Amino acid sequence: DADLDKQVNTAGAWPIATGGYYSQHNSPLAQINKSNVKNVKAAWSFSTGVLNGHEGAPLVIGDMMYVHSAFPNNTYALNLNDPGKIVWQHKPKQDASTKAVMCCDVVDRGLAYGAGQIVKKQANGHLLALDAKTGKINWEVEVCDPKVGSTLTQAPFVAKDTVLMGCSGAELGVRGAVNAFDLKTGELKWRAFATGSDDSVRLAKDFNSANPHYGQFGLGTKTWEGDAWKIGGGTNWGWYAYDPKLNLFYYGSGNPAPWNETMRPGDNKWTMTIWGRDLDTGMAKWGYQKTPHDEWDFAGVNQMVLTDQPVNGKMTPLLSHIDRNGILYTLNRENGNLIVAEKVDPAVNVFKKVDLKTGTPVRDPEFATRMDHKGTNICPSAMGFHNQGVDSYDPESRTLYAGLNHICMDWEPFMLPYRAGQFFVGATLAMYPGPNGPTKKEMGQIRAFDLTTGKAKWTKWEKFAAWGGTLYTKGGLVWYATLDGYLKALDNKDGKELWNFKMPSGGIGSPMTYSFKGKQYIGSMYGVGGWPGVGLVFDLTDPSAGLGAVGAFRELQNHTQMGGGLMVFSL
Amino acid sequence: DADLDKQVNTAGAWPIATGGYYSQHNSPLAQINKSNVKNVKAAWSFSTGVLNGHEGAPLVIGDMMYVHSAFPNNTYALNLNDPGKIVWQHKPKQDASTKAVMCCDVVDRGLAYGAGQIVKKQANGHLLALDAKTGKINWEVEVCDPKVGSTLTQAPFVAKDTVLMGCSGAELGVRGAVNAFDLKTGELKWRAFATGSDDSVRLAKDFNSANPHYGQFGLGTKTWEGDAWKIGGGTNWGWYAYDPKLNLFYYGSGNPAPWNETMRPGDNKWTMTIWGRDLDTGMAKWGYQKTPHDEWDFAGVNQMVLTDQPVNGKMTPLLSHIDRNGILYTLNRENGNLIVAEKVDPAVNVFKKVDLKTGTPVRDPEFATRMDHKGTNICPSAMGFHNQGVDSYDPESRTLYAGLNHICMDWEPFMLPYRAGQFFVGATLAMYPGPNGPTKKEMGQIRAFDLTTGKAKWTKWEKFAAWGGTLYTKGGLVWYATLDGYLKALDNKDGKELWNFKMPSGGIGSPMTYSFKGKQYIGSMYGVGGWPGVGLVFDLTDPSAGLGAVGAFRELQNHTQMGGGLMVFSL
Amino acid sequence: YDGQNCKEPGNCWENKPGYPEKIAGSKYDPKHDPVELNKQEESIKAMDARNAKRIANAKSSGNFVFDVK
Amino acid sequence: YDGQNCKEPGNCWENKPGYPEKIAGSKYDPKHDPVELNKQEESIKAMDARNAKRIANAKSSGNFVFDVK
Ligand SMILES: O=C(O)c1cc(C(=O)O)c2c(n1)C(=O)C(=O)c1cc(C(=O)O)[nH]c1-2
Ligand SMILES: O=C(O)c1cc(C(=O)O)c2c(n1)C(=O)C(=O)c1cc(C(=O)O)[nH]c1-2
Ligand SMILES: [Ca+2]
Ligand SMILES: [Ca+2]
């Protein structure tokens, strides 16, 4: 709304989790730069009093900072003039059973802001709007039902007078949908499903008119056998982007359920699709399915980054996205035209390539999955070569600094029944480091990309996956947190490490920045968890436990322990 | 043993929780001083992955640091050359029921070191010796039995080839005793009880020969009615001191059980006693009971500080101690002679004064407790004007910097039966700030004292109780952590605040210091809890809950949340 | 199955060698229970009903209360 | 009761005015169960026995084991 726009245009504020409507996750603040970053020091810290994974990052509105924790989803408001005083706090009362239906740690990616309110959700499916100054609850509504395996983890997204919220739960057969609510009253505007009839999916009359070969009408049911689409997955729990001039918002729908591909023949549309939908009506103008008939859990919910750059000398409104499947996609955000579809790392073998003319991946049968067969050395793994991290873009050098994962896997599916409220996966996995690391043990990479060609400019290897993402600040710095516990700053020119600090625990969120009283501050949550930390957080030892992540991250416990909090830095 | 002595004489090491055998908790390191303290910054941090109160402080042996957490009592070893790697760790498997019999949060005051081993205990009563380099368990024995309400919280104490350990549990009628074990095998050498026959209490033939009026033989049963002494408390869960020349170790025995004074007529010896025992045999040379027939839960387990200062003109071997009852005691540590017994604050009203001639407190009937009567405005409260904090001494100016509490109470007892394994308190309380704070709201004080006269030099008031204690470094600085989350440094001359840092959570341990590669570091645990934090830790709202502490500390949750970790600072 | 053989635009799925074109009646038949499949729809309807009552009440009470029914 | 009236050195307790010199048989009689009172002693006895066994084994076998009987 107008209030949010006011904040967005205020220097030093941080009202949106992704950095702005375009989700470039950057900042023009240049007080801290390459020549003085070595002098950055800790300013203050704050514990949430909760353990488990602490994803996302705080919001800063005016002289107020809003911090969020993992389940039970507590909210703390602090006035920056005195970080030692909690102005107000909201501590939800939720049934502990809610944790049992969450696939990947009890995480929360953050808060949103709009119309003078903090918009927050709870894992148990409630969505609330609280007065930003007092914490008083203006409205509270139900969005998901844990009884059927649906929970809330993603950050809400506010555009104009609408709040976008999507439930999680594809691992439990939850049919995905983006829900739109009125910012002021909480009233349901509309709901757009990922599978089913065209009416339920909400397709515009001119849906994909520019690219008919992507598929148009009736595919939400036709690309499935029988009523399998009813428990077909496609949940969107990642990030959104919005273009005010076109009034289109963008996001990706998740993986189809179950993981056992043999139990769901068909392209399974419209799971793993990049969407361009009208904010007012929710009607899709265009949609591109990245991974037809998923066989690897490449949940297509990753960040959408909007940029305007010249493509072969021609200025074009773009949308870029690095999917779990290891492909970097760049499309015209106006009509969905496919421009770039390149592997982020040569290890990707599930596809030979993505054919730009047919618009579909050329599958390599040797790395497919199927019943009564164990696939091996499949790259990327289900964790993907990119997960929930929020990356940054430097508009001057026109570079995207991506936090990547370099993990591959072995996979064998198995038959299982669907029972509402219970897990519906159907696959046994083993995950391990990819083949390209210097010592073949490295699982993380910070890699700079040109979004118009898909070519990399430089690479920095990390022992563990770069799960949280990166932040770019005009001073020429790429900031990011590591699973092993460090907040680091790199020279954006070559990836050279210029500064670092050992936080209490690994970080799985992306750093943020703000200004207060003329000083630039960098903030980062800490508290390892999420999928990579499941073994550590739940004391698991079986290598195949945690959907196969336990074995791959067994060494993490020798570098960090759980935690939960925020650390702020400045000159 | 000889190994421990080597570490004690190694500049920059920190092998003993209290700073040394004399427990002066100070340091000759002067790199950081009044002129540059403003430049101190955070060096690194480490989360324990556990919540609840984090008391004590880490140990530094050579280039290794050993960190401990609250229940389940985890141990982490780190090499200072790379704080990001955990060399070895010990994570006990304990029954969660253990927490149910712990009175005042599931805290752990620290580890000990001796003969190349880390000596650690577990809340469930186990005492272990682990190889300092590998973490391999050399021996593990049972010391306390939670089934009868006995648990372990205090830090072990090593002197020569003996490990001293005392169980906690007076609030459950546990009969106190100091247990001595062989450092190399863990074999029980002897144990000295706080109540019972002279043989069980282990008294030397010349016990109190210098001060017969303190009482001598047969009082461990005579000052009780019947077998009430069998569940008479007297547990020692505080700190120890040791004089190598005299070969005597000192400590204080706790409060008698139950809290209901009417249920236990008699002086209740030897609870509330300052002891001077031979380390080899455990036989007591002298013993002074500070609070005969306790009526306020003034558990006399506080820190014993040994110093050598001139009294009236002649150098004298002293022992100083600030008890829960609000009296500062200084005695000749060789024979037990009473030299000083002054109130630490004029608000103390339970006693008119302590008569140095009779050696006993002159009780004021107006502030006593008793059945069928509600005592009001009693100072100090059961939390005392001094609790488990470890204070520091500056040998230059001959000043003790004490962390005090300024809390008083209302108290009324009630009848209740004794059942092994269940709480045995029998009193309802209400606590609130003392009457002398600048705004009558302050509950903490950092007060400087001359131990030969008992007079104060300066006072700095704190909103909350100064629970953890203080550290004094030769640079002229008094360091301490607050319950609201700050680590602070004061000018030792006038108490002026020179520096502070906002840690993630309040601190309830005392700071420590060490040197590594020529640099001096300051270390402090963080993670609020202990008795003051019970309301916050267990989400209590009833003001009388938490043995009456919930009401007094109701505002703490507006300044801090739980946490668990270590923060290290340096130039 | 290379993903390049489409019988219709946007529909390029093919059964892998040795697997059935239709799983109904095959050894891979999921045999989904229609009763279980409709659970989500039933949940969303009840949920929407509850929210509608909350909104209406607030719009006609000036005060928003969640526990209302 | 000001604590200054001692019947014997180190024994200065006095019943408060209105309270009994001895509580046995009075309204303040705790009536402690003898068996309940000895539970701690019985606990330590068993505990010491288990430790002795552990120490003995390690001394003869050269290897320390906690679980043993
Ligand atoms: O299908 C779903 O709805 C769903 C939900 C979530 C989530 O909300 O945490 C994750 C996933 N899938 C998933 O595929 C995955 O890789 C993942 C990682 C994490 C995380 O926060 O570390 N969450 C999720
Ligand atoms: O009688 C006992 O054995 C016993 C044990 C403990 C303990 O070990 O924590 C405390 C107390 N009493 C007690 O009196 C008290 O004031 C106290 C405070 C704390 C703390 O760590 O904050 N523990 C204890
Ligand atoms: Ca998924
Ligand atoms: Ca006590």
Side-chain angles (χ1 to χ4, degrees):
Chain A
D1 68 315
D3 189 21
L4 178 53
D5 285 320
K6 182 181 180 180
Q7 303 311 305
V8 171
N9 290 296
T10 298
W14 190 269
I16 299 174
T18 50
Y21 296 123
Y22 282 9
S23 296
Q24 303 191 345
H25 201 243
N26 54 204
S27 170
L29 296 181
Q31 186 176 74
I32 303 177
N33 55 56
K34 304 183 190 181
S35 68
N36 62 26
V37 65
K38 65 182 179 181
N39 298 304
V40 170
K41 61 185 176 183
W44 52 275
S45 57
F46 176 83
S47 184
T48 56
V50 178
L51 296 174
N52 289 279
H54 278 62
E55 289 176 354
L59 293 182
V60 170
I61 306 302
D63 62 353
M64 291 288 280
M65 179 183 276
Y66 301 91
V67 185
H68 75 287
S69 74
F71 180 88
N73 313 97
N74 294 161
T75 304
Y76 308 95
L78 311 170
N79 186 299
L80 296 170
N81 288 86
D82 186 0
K85 177 67 180 185
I86 303 176
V87 183
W88 63 257
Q89 47 187 296
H90 178 66
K91 291 190 169 190
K93 291 300 184 63
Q94 305 182 61
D95 200 72
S97 68
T98 302
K99 298 187 293 185
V101 287
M102 294 182 85
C103 75
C104 317
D105 195 13
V106 299
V107 300
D108 181 338
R109 296 189 191 81
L111 306 165
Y113 174 90
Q117 314 170 104
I118 289 301
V119 183
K120 72 167 287 176
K121 52 67 172 55
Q122 296 176 359
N124 72 349
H126 296 200
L127 174 63
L128 307 76
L130 304 64
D131 183 75
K133 300 178 180 58
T134 66
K136 189 184 71 62
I137 301 175
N138 292 329
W139 54 259
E140 179 176 3
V141 299
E142 286 173 274
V143 186
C144 320
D145 179 15
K147 293 180 176 301
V148 295
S150 186
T151 58
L152 283 175
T153 64
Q154 78 166 180
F157 191 82
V158 179
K160 296 210 295 185
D161 290 349
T162 303
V163 177
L164 298 178
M165 190 85 266
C167 303
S168 294
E171 271 63 76
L172 299 98
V174 174
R175 177 165 170 242
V178 55
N179 311 94
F181 300 91
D182 182 74
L183 179 61
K184 175 182 179 64
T185 68
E187 181 174 4
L188 179 67
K189 251 68 173 302
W190 43 263
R191 182 177 283 124
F193 293 91
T195 68
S197 65
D198 291 350
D199 294 308
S200 68
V201 176
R202 297 186 80 77
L203 299 182
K205 293 301 188 300
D206 55 355
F207 177 66
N208 280 336
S209 56
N211 294 286
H213 59 302
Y214 286 179
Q216 287 178 294
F217 307 110
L219 300 177
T221 56
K222 181 179 299 182
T223 62
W224 298 82
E225 187 184 311
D227 299 314
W229 53 270
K230 293 188 178 182
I231 52 170
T235 49
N236 62 293
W237 48 277
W239 314 89
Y240 304 88
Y242 173 62
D243 180 335
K245 186 171 63 179
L246 299 169
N247 196 47
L248 291 174
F249 71 88
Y250 313 82
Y251 74 99
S253 46
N255 62 291
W259 287 24
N260 182 334
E261 69 84 48
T262 316
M263 284 176 60
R264 51 173 168 73
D267 276 1
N268 309 323
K269 283 180 164 64
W270 290 89
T271 56
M272 40 252 268
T273 296
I274 300 182
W275 303 90
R277 296 181 177 279
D278 176 86
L279 180 68
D280 296 349
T281 64
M283 298 289 256
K285 190 76 173 186
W286 59 265
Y288 173 69
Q289 190 182 217
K290 297 165 291 174
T291 309
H293 189 68
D294 181 49
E295 296 174 15
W296 316 270
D297 183 32
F298 290 152
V301 305
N302 291 179
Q303 180 193 194
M304 297 300 170
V305 180
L306 313 184
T307 65
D308 303 312
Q309 308 178 231
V311 180
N312 297 309
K314 181 181 179 181
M315 186 58 76
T316 309
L318 309 165
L319 171 152
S320 287
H321 173 247
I322 297 172
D323 190 68
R324 289 259 284 272
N325 68 15
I327 302 298
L328 182 162
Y329 298 90
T330 288
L331 299 72
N332 177 305
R333 71 168 180 275
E334 275 191 49
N335 56 200
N337 284 355
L338 189 56
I339 302 177
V340 177
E342 295 290 311
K343 295 179 175 181
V344 296
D345 189 280
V348 175
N349 57 23
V350 292
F351 309 148
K352 296 285 183 53
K353 69 173 294 180
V354 173
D355 191 302
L356 297 177
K357 300 184 179 181
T358 64
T360 62
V362 178
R363 315 168 91 85
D364 186 331
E366 191 185 310
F367 300 98
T369 66
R370 52 194 172 80
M371 272 295 292
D372 301 306
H373 169 70
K374 179 183 183 178
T376 61
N377 293 298
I378 298 170
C379 304
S381 67
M383 291 188 101
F385 271 11
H386 197 298
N387 203 285
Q388 63 95 237
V390 172
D391 300 325
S392 57
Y393 173 74
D394 166 23
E396 294 193 298
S397 71
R398 299 196 295 92
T399 310
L400 176 91
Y401 307 102
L404 305 176
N405 309 149
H406 196 61
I407 306 170
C408 304
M409 68 178 21
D410 290 341
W411 170 308
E412 181 170 1
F414 60 79
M415 302 295 293
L416 77 172
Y418 168 75
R419 306 191 77 175
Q422 290 169 48
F423 280 92
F424 186 50
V425 185
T428 295
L429 293 55
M431 289 187 252
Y432 39 80
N436 297 153
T439 62
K440 297 182 189 303
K441 287 213 308 171
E442 295 78 14
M443 299 187 277
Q445 299 159 307
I446 297 304
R447 180 164 280 169
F449 289 106
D450 174 303
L451 302 172
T452 69
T453 64
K455 301 305 176 183
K457 304 187 176 183
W458 54 255
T459 304
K460 175 177 175 61
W461 287 89
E462 279 288 344
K463 185 175 182 176
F464 297 102
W467 206 257
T470 65
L471 168 71
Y472 174 73
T473 59
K474 191 173 173 57
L477 302 166
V478 180
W479 306 80
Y480 70 100
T482 65
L483 293 179
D484 49 302
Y486 291 87
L487 177 62
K488 302 180 175 184
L490 312 178
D491 182 323
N492 77 314
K493 180 193 67 176
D494 54 19
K496 177 175 182 296
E497 181 165 335
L498 310 177
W499 175 92
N500 68 60
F501 181 84
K502 173 57 175 56
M503 299 189 293
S505 178
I508 50 176
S510 197
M512 53 80 197
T513 187
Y514 63 96
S515 188
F516 176 63
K517 289 189 180 305
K519 298 190 67 176
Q520 173 183 7
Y521 292 80
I522 296 292
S524 177
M525 298 298 292
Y526 63 82
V528 72
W531 200 355
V534 296
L536 176 57
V537 176
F538 298 118
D539 294 346
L540 302 177
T541 53
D542 186 312
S544 62
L547 303 172
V550 174
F553 288 91
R554 61 187 181 65
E555 292 183 57
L556 194 58
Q557 61 182 299
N558 296 154
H559 294 268
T560 189
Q561 293 292 300
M562 288 196 287
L566 166 74
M567 274 205 77
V568 176
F569 305 80
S570 76
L571 289 173
Chain B
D1 67 316
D3 188 19
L4 180 59
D5 289 314
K6 175 181 172 57
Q7 286 304 306
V8 173
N9 292 297
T10 297
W14 188 272
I16 302 172
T18 48
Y21 294 125
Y22 284 10
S23 295
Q24 306 193 336
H25 201 246
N26 54 207
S27 170
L29 298 180
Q31 187 178 72
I32 301 174
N33 54 57
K34 303 180 189 180
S35 301
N36 60 31
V37 66
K38 67 180 183 301
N39 300 307
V40 172
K41 67 183 184 302
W44 52 274
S45 55
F46 177 85
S47 180
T48 58
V50 181
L51 296 176
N52 288 274
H54 277 63
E55 299 182 336
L59 292 180
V60 171
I61 304 301
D63 61 346
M64 293 286 281
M65 178 184 277
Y66 300 92
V67 182
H68 76 287
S69 74
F71 180 87
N73 312 95
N74 301 324
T75 308
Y76 308 94
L78 308 170
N79 187 289
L80 296 172
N81 281 280
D82 187 352
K85 295 179 172 55
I86 301 171
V87 181
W88 64 258
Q89 55 189 295
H90 178 69
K91 290 191 170 186
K93 264 62 69 61
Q94 308 186 59
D95 189 307
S97 63
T98 300
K99 302 185 296 179
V101 290
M102 296 184 87
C103 77
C104 320
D105 199 10
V106 298
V107 297
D108 181 336
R109 299 191 188 79
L111 304 162
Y113 174 90
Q117 308 172 119
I118 285 299
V119 181
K120 71 166 291 176
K121 53 67 172 54
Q122 304 179 343
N124 72 349
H126 294 195
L127 175 60
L128 307 75
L130 301 63
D131 181 77
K133 302 176 185 302
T134 67
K136 177 183 179 299
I137 300 177
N138 294 332
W139 55 258
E140 180 177 3
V141 298
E142 296 178 71
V143 186
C144 319
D145 180 12
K147 271 54 181 299
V148 304
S150 192
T151 59
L152 281 173
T153 62
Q154 74 162 183
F157 192 81
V158 175
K160 294 209 292 186
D161 291 351
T162 300
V163 179
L164 299 177
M165 188 89 267
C167 302
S168 290
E171 270 65 74
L172 299 95
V174 176
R175 179 174 170 228
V178 55
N179 308 282
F181 300 85
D182 181 69
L183 177 59
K184 181 171 60 185
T185 63
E187 185 180 300
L188 177 70
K189 294 188 177 184
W190 50 259
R191 65 163 60 88
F193 291 89
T195 69
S197 68
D198 296 314
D199 292 311
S200 66
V201 180
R202 299 185 76 75
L203 302 173
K205 49 68 180 297
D206 59 353
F207 177 64
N208 283 334
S209 65
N211 296 285
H213 59 298
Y214 285 0
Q216 291 177 296
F217 309 108
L219 299 175
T221 55
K222 199 166 185 176
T223 61
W224 296 79
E225 188 182 310
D227 296 325
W229 55 267
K230 291 190 174 184
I231 57 176
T235 50
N236 61 292
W237 47 276
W239 313 90
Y240 302 90
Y242 173 64
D243 182 335
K245 185 176 180 57
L246 305 172
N247 189 54
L248 292 176
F249 71 90
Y250 313 79
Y251 72 101
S253 46
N255 61 292
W259 285 24
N260 183 332
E261 70 84 49
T262 315
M263 286 178 67
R264 55 175 164 69
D267 276 356
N268 305 317
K269 284 176 168 61
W270 291 88
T271 59
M272 309 296 216
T273 300
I274 302 180
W275 303 90
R277 294 177 178 282
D278 176 279
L279 179 66
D280 294 339
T281 66
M283 299 294 256
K285 186 60 60 184
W286 59 267
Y288 171 72
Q289 192 186 211
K290 302 165 290 173
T291 309
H293 193 253
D294 174 55
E295 304 172 9
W296 314 273
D297 182 35
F298 290 155
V301 302
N302 289 181
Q303 180 193 193
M304 296 302 166
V305 183
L306 311 184
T307 65
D308 305 310
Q309 310 180 232
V311 182
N312 293 307
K314 59 176 60 61
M315 190 61 73
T316 308
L318 310 172
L319 171 160
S320 292
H321 175 243
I322 298 173
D323 191 64
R324 288 262 284 273
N325 67 15
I327 301 298
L328 178 165
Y329 298 89
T330 288
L331 298 66
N332 180 304
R333 71 168 181 273
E334 195 174 302
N335 56 199
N337 285 352
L338 189 60
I339 302 180
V340 176
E342 299 291 311
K343 296 178 176 184
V344 297
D345 188 279
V348 175
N349 57 24
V350 292
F351 307 147
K352 293 290 185 59
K353 63 200 302 176
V354 175
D355 197 348
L356 298 178
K357 303 171 186 176
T358 62
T360 59
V362 174
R363 315 166 90 83
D364 186 329
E366 191 179 312
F367 303 96
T369 67
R370 52 193 170 82
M371 273 293 296
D372 302 303
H373 169 66
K374 179 180 178 177
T376 58
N377 296 298
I378 298 173
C379 303
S381 67
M383 296 188 101
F385 270 10
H386 197 296
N387 204 286
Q388 64 91 237
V390 171
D391 303 324
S392 57
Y393 174 72
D394 166 27
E396 298 165 289
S397 66
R398 297 164 54 186
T399 309
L400 182 80
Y401 305 103
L404 307 175
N405 309 151
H406 196 61
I407 306 169
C408 304
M409 67 179 172
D410 287 346
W411 172 306
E412 169 159 31
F414 58 80
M415 302 296 298
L416 79 172
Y418 168 76
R419 185 176 53 177
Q422 299 296 301
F423 280 87
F424 187 50
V425 183
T428 186
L429 295 62
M431 291 188 254
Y432 39 78
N436 298 319
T439 64
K440 298 186 299 296
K441 297 173 61 180
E442 297 77 13
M443 296 188 278
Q445 303 155 304
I446 296 302
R447 178 165 283 168
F449 290 109
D450 175 300
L451 302 176
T452 67
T453 69
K455 302 303 177 184
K457 300 187 179 186
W458 53 256
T459 305
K460 175 186 172 60
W461 288 85
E462 279 287 343
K463 178 174 181 56
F464 298 99
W467 208 255
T470 67
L471 169 71
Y472 173 74
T473 60
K474 194 179 177 62
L477 301 165
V478 180
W479 307 76
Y480 72 96
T482 65
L483 294 175
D484 43 62
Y486 290 85
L487 179 61
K488 299 180 178 185
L490 311 178
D491 184 321
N492 77 313
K493 179 179 67 293
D494 53 18
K496 183 179 183 179
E497 179 165 340
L498 299 175
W499 175 92
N500 70 63
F501 181 85
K502 171 61 176 54
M503 299 190 291
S505 182
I508 51 178
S510 195
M512 54 79 75
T513 185
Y514 63 95
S515 69
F516 178 64
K517 287 185 180 178
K519 295 191 66 175
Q520 173 182 8
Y521 293 86
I522 294 295
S524 179
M525 296 299 291
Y526 62 80
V528 73
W531 199 353
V534 291
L536 184 169
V537 167
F538 303 101
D539 293 358
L540 306 173
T541 51
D542 188 313
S544 69
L547 298 173
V550 170
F553 292 91
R554 69 171 67 70
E555 292 185 3
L556 192 55
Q557 63 188 304
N558 294 150
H559 296 268
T560 187
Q561 292 293 296
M562 287 196 287
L566 166 75
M567 278 214 77
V568 180
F569 306 80
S570 76
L571 292 169
Chain C
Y1 175 41
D2 62 3
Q4 310 305 119
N5 189 181
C6 317
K7 65 175 63 179
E8 304 173 61
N11 191 337
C12 318
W13 181 81
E14 290 180 291
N15 54 303
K16 292 175 181 65
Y19 295 80
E21 307 184 307
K22 287 184 174 58
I23 57 176
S26 74
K27 61 180 179 180
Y28 298 126
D29 190 328
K31 299 179 182 178
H32 291 312
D33 187 321
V35 177
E36 293 292 339
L37 298 180
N38 292 163
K39 303 296 294 304
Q40 294 179 61
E41 181 173 59
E42 293 294 302
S43 172
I44 296 177
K45 287 183 177 178
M47 186 177 80
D48 282 352
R50 290 199 292 285
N51 287 329
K53 193 166 184 177
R54 298 178 176 118
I55 299 299
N57 177 296
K59 195 174 189 301
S60 62
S61 180
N63 186 187
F64 188 107
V65 184
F66 182 90
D67 307 67
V68 61
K69 187 179 180 180
Chain D
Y1 173 43
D2 61 2
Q4 310 302 131
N5 187 186
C6 315
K7 59 162 59 65
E8 308 176 308
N11 190 335
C12 316
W13 181 82
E14 291 180 293
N15 55 299
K16 292 176 180 62
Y19 295 83
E21 300 183 64
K22 295 179 173 300
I23 57 176
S26 69
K27 56 182 177 179
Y28 302 129
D29 188 320
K31 295 186 174 59
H32 294 314
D33 182 300
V35 180
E36 204 63 43
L37 297 180
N38 295 312
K39 286 191 176 181
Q40 288 182 64
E41 176 178 56
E42 182 173 300
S43 177
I44 296 176
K45 193 175 301 177
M47 184 176 83
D48 282 354
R50 292 195 292 283
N51 285 333
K53 181 153 54 184
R54 301 182 177 109
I55 302 300
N57 301 312
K59 192 174 300 177
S60 62
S61 68
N63 177 55
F64 191 109
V65 180
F66 182 87
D67 295 66
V68 59
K69 186 180 179 180

